Structure formats: C-alpha cells, structure tokens
Amino acid sequence: EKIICRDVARGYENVPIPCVNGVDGEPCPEDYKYISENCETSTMNIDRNITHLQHCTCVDDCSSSNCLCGQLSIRCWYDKDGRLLQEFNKIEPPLIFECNQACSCWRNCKNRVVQSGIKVRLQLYRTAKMGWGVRALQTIPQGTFICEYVGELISDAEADVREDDSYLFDLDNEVYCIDARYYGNISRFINHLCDPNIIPVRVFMLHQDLRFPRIAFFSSRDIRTGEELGFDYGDRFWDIKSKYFTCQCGSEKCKHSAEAIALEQSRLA
C-alpha cells in the first residue's frame, strides 16, 4: 500500500529497498542495525593475505574455459548476462570462486556477479501471516543473483549460547555462523518457503578463507513481479522452532505446517 520507508538500507546498496505495510499497524522494523557487508564482533582473523588467493591470468573478459577462477568452480557458472548456468546444480550447489584483486583481469569481467551487489528491485513488505517478508518488484529470470545473506560472523560455540536463533545461517565445513539478529541486511527478512524460489550458494570473492564463505541467493526459477522470495531454512531450524510455531507458507508441498507435523505424528503409530 503506502511506502513507510524509502530505503531500509540507508543508501548502502546499489538500489534502494523500500518498506510498505498494507496489512497491519506495524511500523518499519527498527530493532536491528542494517549493514551491507558481514561484520565481526570478536577476533576472527579472516585470511586476507593477497598471496593466498588463487587467481586467473586472463586478459579477456574471463568468458573462456581457461579461466582458473572458473576452473576452481569446476566451470564458471555465470552466462554472459551474469546468471547461473542452466545445468547449475541447484540441489547441491558447488562453491563459486569469483575473480579478485590478484587476478590479471578487469573489474568488469564476467566472473564478478556477487561482488557487484544487488541489481534487482526488492521490497520489504508486511505479509499476511509471516510478519515481514521480501518480494520482487520486477520479473527475475531463473539464475539471477538476488542478494547476499549478510550479518554478524560468529563461532559455533558463540551460536550455542545465542538466545535468539531466528536469524541464523550455518556456514559449515571449525564451523561458523552468520547471525543476522542484531546486524543484518535485507536477507534477514526473507521467509521460509517449502516451495522455495531462491537457493543459497557459497561464494568466495576478496578472500578465500574456507571458514567464511559468503552466502549468495540466486533465483531457482523465473520469479514474477510481486512474488514473495523464500528459501528452505532447513531441518535444523524447523526441528527447533516447530514446537513454537508452524509453517504458514501455504504450499501443498508444505512439510512444516501443523497439519503436516500432525499427519507424520499420526502415521507414527
């Protein structure tokens, strides 16, 4: 309905991300700090040694199969328009290694999609049943980079004592987490869908410290204007939270609704 905030990102993204609410009286969320890149709250010592970067020697646009950075990702998974290859493994995505400051290529090469930031028009809006959510203000073709899951990098030991685990993304590999509860970007508002339309992909850009992949959401199908974005939060989230609330995604594939939980519980016998 009417726009309550012109840009929740305070100008830190390539495009503004407005907030609207046509459902209830809740004002624009303001109990967190918007950040556009991951932050640290303890000593993490991400390995930023430029000599530890694997890098390419391309003098073209890194569209050839001899791009070392593409080879690290098995092959460069970006097409000429920056979208994931149509054979990209969406079920089990590979690690993507983008070009970096040690590569001989130019900053506009074809292997720098995620580091170039948000390009699609997104909107923070009030959903009917799931609080705030994020939807597209444009058609988004399948394979398009949407946004990064940005927040506070924390150790697994720190995550184990975090009281609010509603905004946690496990990185896995000596395992770390992104906590977007107190510091986060637009992705902290993306809800869970049992029939998701975006997938998280682990990406390396300016560093290649394998403890800290950056989490990039790409569309898993064509997305229509106005459609809510959502990914599969996974079973660790729902094993913990189903006791407190159930899924409202409304899909016929929904496996975390009260009915879905009760039906598997009845089948139990």
Ligand X SMILES: COc1cc2nc(N(C)C3CCCC3)nc(NC3CCN(C)CC3)c2cc1OC
Residue ranges of the annotated binding site for Zn(2+) are 56, 58, 62, 67, 69, 99, 103, 105, 109, 194, 247, 249, 254
Which of 180, 168, 132 is CA-nearest to residue 18? 132
User: CB-wise, 111 or 191, nearer to ligand X?
Assistant: 191
Binding residues (CB under 6 A) for ligand SAM: these are 130-133, 166-167, 188-189, 191-192, 241, 245, 247-249
96 bridge partner residues: 203
3-state SS string over 2-31?
Answer: CEEECCCCCCCCCCCCCEECCCCCCCCCCC
Closest approach, Cβ 109 to Zn ion, in A, equals 3
132 bridge partner residues: 126
Binding of Zn ion at residue 109 (CB under 5 A)? yes
156 binds, among ligand SAM, Zn ion, ligand X, none (CB under 5 to 8 A by kind): ligand X
- Strands 19-20 and 3-5, sheet pairing: antiparallel
Binding of Zn ion at residue 154 (CB under 5 A)? no
Distance CA 128, CA 21 (A): 10
Backbone angles phi, psi at 18, to 5 degrees: -75, 160
Binding of Zn ion at residue 62 (CB under 5 A)? yes
The answer to whether 188 and 180 have CB atoms below 8 angstroms apart is yes
Give the residues lining the site for Zn ion (CB under 5 A).
56, 58, 62, 67, 69, 99, 103, 105, 109, 111, 194, 247, 249, 254, 256
Positions that interact with ligand X (CB under 6 A)? 156, 159-160, 162, 165, 168-170, 175, 177, 233-234, 236-237, 240-241
